[PDB]
Design a protein around this nucleic acid. Structure first.
Ligand SMILES: [Mg+2]
Ligand SMILES: [Mg+2]
Ligand SMILES: [Mg+2]
Ligand SMILES: [Mg+2]
Ligand SMILES: [Mg+2]
Ligand SMILES: [Mg+2]
Ligand SMILES: [Mg+2]
Ligand SMILES: [Mg+2]
Ligand SMILES: [Mg+2]
Ligand SMILES: [Mg+2]
Lengths: 129, 252, 88, 151
RNA sequence: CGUAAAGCGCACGCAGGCGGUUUGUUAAGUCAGAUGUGAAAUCCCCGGGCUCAACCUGGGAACUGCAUCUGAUACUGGCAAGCUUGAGUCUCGUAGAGGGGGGUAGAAUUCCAGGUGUAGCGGUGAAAUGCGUAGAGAUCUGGAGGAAUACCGGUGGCGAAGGCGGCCCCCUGGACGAAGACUGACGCUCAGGUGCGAAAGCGUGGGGAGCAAACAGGAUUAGAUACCCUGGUAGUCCACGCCGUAAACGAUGUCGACUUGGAGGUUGUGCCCUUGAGGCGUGGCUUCCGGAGCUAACGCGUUAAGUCGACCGCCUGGGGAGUACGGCCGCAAGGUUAAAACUCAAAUGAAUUGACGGGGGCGCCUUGAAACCGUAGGGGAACCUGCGGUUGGAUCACCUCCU
RNA sequence: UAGCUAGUAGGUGGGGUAACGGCUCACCUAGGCGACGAUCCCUAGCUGGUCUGAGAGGAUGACCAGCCACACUGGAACUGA
């Protein structure tokens, strides 16, 4: 059955990127919206939006730079089979700091770059570059 | 077809035979000169059958051997070993090696002469030898091994690798010796009753003997003999088989 | 595998109204009635393993529904298993 | 087990006695290789070097006229601190001494033995088997070893 | 983990793991900070001292931890409340060798009873054994009995898998579409566990047409145990027990999401049909191509072997060996779980080029050239035979070298 | 190596220790433990550390420091802080 709604959106991003799709869409959820926001805030996508009351849909507009996908790697480290937590300093570096990790802290979701200078460890969602 | 090639095991077989005068010795299937020579050597004089008349000429014309043996040129299953036992003064030592389709016949013809034979000494294929000596409670056991162990005491002599043979087979093979009992440890009223009891039983070896020998005897007969009819045919020793044979013969 | 009318009697007993089908009560009741009826089938048709594969699916489905209702509301659970005499 | 054991003995005797050494035992085994094992002794002594000499000689003087060469290799040996032994005269040197035997007769009152040599007959070894005594023919035995006490 | 070793024969299901979505609450996990503690020595850093070094030594750092307190509230967990997308009920249809039970039909073989009839029949390469003058064989009629469903029938349907095929009835399982309605996360997976599970064989009692291990007898062959033939028991059938394995293989675990196309098949359904054909759609199932990607390669390819999430099963060189032993299980066969010593430098998968070779066609292109699985029984062999499953239907390999 | 256990598990009361306590004893209850591996059998003193390893790990516990146990073998008990 469905057991990871986040890996589902990330694999939709990958598969949509590889399929050259201008956008991809998902059953929305509050966490997915926050995720989509932080990766728009690091510029990995053109835009995201949500459409419809009751059942919701979250659409992601995939970014292509000249001839190619902007995201080339996206993977999620907190398997629902085993969660992952890191201290404020133990927040990892993606592509030696070129890339991003996503941290759910007790003051919300943010990039590892934000989280380490904010002094908060937390749970780690995923890596992207 | 096969005959041996390597002196080590040839010498082992002919020495293990212990062929000397004071014994009524006769070869069958002299084959290649290499294994018939040492036995025709150690016995001052020796009898032989070869089935082939051309090989019988090759060996009878061989001056090591023709002057040192008396030679016969026919199917041994025709041959009157009971008269040869009289001509050789005492019951025979019968021995050698063959193409061995004839093996199954050899045993029955030898058993037709259990009086006229003192002992038998022969090479045979691994599976049939291990069957021939098999203990009653084993899958290797069965009707032909029963009849063999009925007629004679049976004794493996030595075992030989396949590269030892002139055309080397894939199949390891052993020389075996056997001894018609001086008195039958299992006295029997007839052997045809044994032969048919054993074939019926082994033709049905997966089912209970109530569903094998109990197709002829009753369960109350079998248990009356002291035999549990719920056994399988391959649980049953030659002792109770000859007891059944006597029961069949004497109650008929 | 049930007549519309036996279904109607059961849903009009265990159901909220005629608009309800598939409230847990409706389900477990009609499922139970089917299971009860099929005892007569298998009491003749011992060797009907392919049919009894459906029966095994049904009794386990009954168990799953009951256990959900038991954790959702013990009162509805206890009065429902009382009415059907379930946990017999 | 050997080919033509007397012929083999004499062909081996020629370099053995040319070296002034003495034969003791000849035995062959048939298996993964098939191989020939020569026991030689000389009571001044046999070194590894004396084995090396007679072995290089037989490795020539037998091979060039081999009656058989199947899978062949050989070794020459001192007869061990527990020694294989083969003849009436051997057991006769060793009357009163502990032994093990395996036989061409293969029957209960088991013809596989531990023994102390009681006396030698012209045809037989008489031996304190199992602290009992019994006698076995030189022909009804097939292999024997002496002072098995030494491991 | 398709073929190199590896996905339980299949399914259900307990424990266990895992779990959509919204709001409140909690604050266990988690995070942050503090406090106590984490022996010294050792380690590391920064110094000092032995002429240097090793060595010694000052001071720091480190001691990933544990406890306690304090906050933090995203996420996870708990609690509470809901939600309808997952799950599932209902109403109406649809297709189907799905299963269980009971009748019944036309072919067919054999057999019996005649009838007509007469020297042959039968069998093979040819023979023989076999059958017939007591009349066979043949052919007509009449009867018996057991077994199986010609054709449709398909690159076709159903079924968890094993499997399911004359026809009708009776009971009965599942599936898919339609259009709503309803419940309200009720879910997935699943160690143990439980049950289903070809063929063979066993157990108890029937049946026995045809076929046929074993067996028997005739032939063939250097031999022939085979291959051939004439016979023939078990078995094959049935009811009721058992066994519990198969190349039980898509050699491919279950569930869920995503990701180019294309040509079919089959089975619902909507709309348009000008009708009847058509033509727009639109589920389900299913076959073959093939893009991307993947893959050792072969190949796989939206029914993945692509991209991924949850759980389970399994493998860790080759032999020894699925063998020992022990336990369990079985009526017995055997099943099952399962070693090690010992031994070897491999063993192995795919694919390339010559042989192939026997050729085959026209010096040239290039092939007229069974293995196994499970199981039961014979047994000169490796082997032979019966039952039914799978396809993985075959070869084998010699003279040196640097930029 | 699957079940284990009768002072066994718990209770009351008596006795007992420097001290709590089946520590022990009377009675009384029928518990208690275990597939989150008890029970059983093999093997081992433990630890700061040490060696290796990029690291995670793996190996290991000689010397030095901390803890433990033992003192011909097996039994006790005196005295004393
Ligand atoms: Mg494999
Ligand atoms: Mg499978
Ligand atoms: Mg959750
Ligand atoms: Mg919560
Ligand atoms: Mg039967
Ligand atoms: Mg059957
Ligand atoms: Mg086994
Ligand atoms: Mg199949
Ligand atoms: Mg007290
Ligand atoms: Mg490493």
């Amino acid at each position: 059955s469905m057991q990871d709604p986040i890996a589902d959106m990330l694999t939709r991003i990958r598969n949509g990127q590889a399929a050259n799709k201008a956008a991809v869409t998902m059953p929305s959820s509050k966490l997915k919206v926050a995720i989509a926001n932080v990766l728009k805030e690091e510029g990995f996508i053109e835009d995201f939006k949500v459409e419809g009351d009751t059942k919701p849909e979250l659409e992601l507009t995939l970014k292509y730079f000249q001839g190619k996908a902007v995201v080339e790697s996206i993977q999620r480290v907190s398997r629902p089979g085993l969660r992952i937590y890191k201290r404020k300093d133990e927040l990892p570096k993606v592509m030696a700091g070129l890339g991003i990790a996503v941290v759910s802290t007790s003051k919300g979701v943010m990039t590892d770059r934000a989280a380490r200078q904010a002094g908060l460890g937390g749970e780690i969602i995923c890596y992207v570059a | 077809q096969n005959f041996l090639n390597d002196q080590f095991v040839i010498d082992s077989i002919v020495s293990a035979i212990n062929p000397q005068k004071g014994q009524a010795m006769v070869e069958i299937g002299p084959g290649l000169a290499a294994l018939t020579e040492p036995v025709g050597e150690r016995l001052d004089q020796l009898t032989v059958i070869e089935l082939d008349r051309d090989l019988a000429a090759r060996l009878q014309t061989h001056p090591f051997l023709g002057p040192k043996l008396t030679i016969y040129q026919q199917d041994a299953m025709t041959f009157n070993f009971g008269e040869l036992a009289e001509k050789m003064g005492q019951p025979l030592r019968v021995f050698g090696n063959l193409p061995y389709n004839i093996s199954t016949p050899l045993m029955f013809h030898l058993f037709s002469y259990t009086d006229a034979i003192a002992d038998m000494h022969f090479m045979l294929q691994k599976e049939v030898v291990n069957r021939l000596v098999a203990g009653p409670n084993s899958k290797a056991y069965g009707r032909l091994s029963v009849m063999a162990q009925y007629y004679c005491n049976v004794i493996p002599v030595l075992e030989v690798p396949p590269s030892a043979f002139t055309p080397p087979p894939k199949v390891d093979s052993a020389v075996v010796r056997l001894v018609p009992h001086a008195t039958m440890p299992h006295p029997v009223k007839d052997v045809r009753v044994l032969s048919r009891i054993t074939t019926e039983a082994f033709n049905q070896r997966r089912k209970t003997i109530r569903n094998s020998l109990g197709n002829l005897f009753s369960v109350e007969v079998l248990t009356g003999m002291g035999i549990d009819p719920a056994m399988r045919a391959e649980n049953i020793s030659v002792a109770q088989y000859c007891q059944m044979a006597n029961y069949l013969a004497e109650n008929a | 595998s049930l007549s519309t009318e036996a279904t109607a009697k059961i849903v009009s007993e265990f159901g909220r109204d005629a608009n309800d089908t598939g409230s847990t009560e409706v389900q477990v009741a009609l499922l139970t009635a089917q299971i009860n009826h099929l005892q007569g089938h298998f009491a003749e048709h011992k060797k009907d393993h392919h049919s009894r594969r459906g029966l095994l699916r049904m009794v386990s489905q009954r168990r799953k529904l009951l256990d959900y209702l038991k954790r959702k509301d013990v009162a509805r659970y206890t009065q429902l298993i009382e009415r059907l005499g379930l946990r017999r | 087990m050997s080919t033509l054991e007397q012929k083999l003995t004499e062909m081996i005797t020629a370099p053995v006695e040319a070296l002034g050494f003495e034969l003791v035992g000849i035995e062959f085994i048939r298996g993964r290789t098939s191989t020939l094992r020569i026991y030689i002794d000389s009571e001044d002594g046999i070194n590894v070097d004396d084995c090396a000499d007679v072995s290089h000689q037989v490795s020539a003087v037998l091979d060039v006229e081999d009656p058989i060469t199947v899978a062949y290799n050989l070794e020459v040996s001192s007869p061990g601190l527990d020694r294989p032994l083969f003849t009436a005269e051997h057991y006769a040197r060793f009357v009163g001494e502990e032994v093990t035997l395996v036989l061409r007769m293969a029957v209960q009152n088991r013809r596989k033995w531990q023994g102390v040599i009681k006396a030698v007959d012209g045809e037989m070894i008489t031996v304190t088997v199992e602290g009992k005594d019994e006698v076995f023919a030189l022909s009804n035995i097939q292999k024997a070893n002496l002072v098995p006490h030494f491991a």
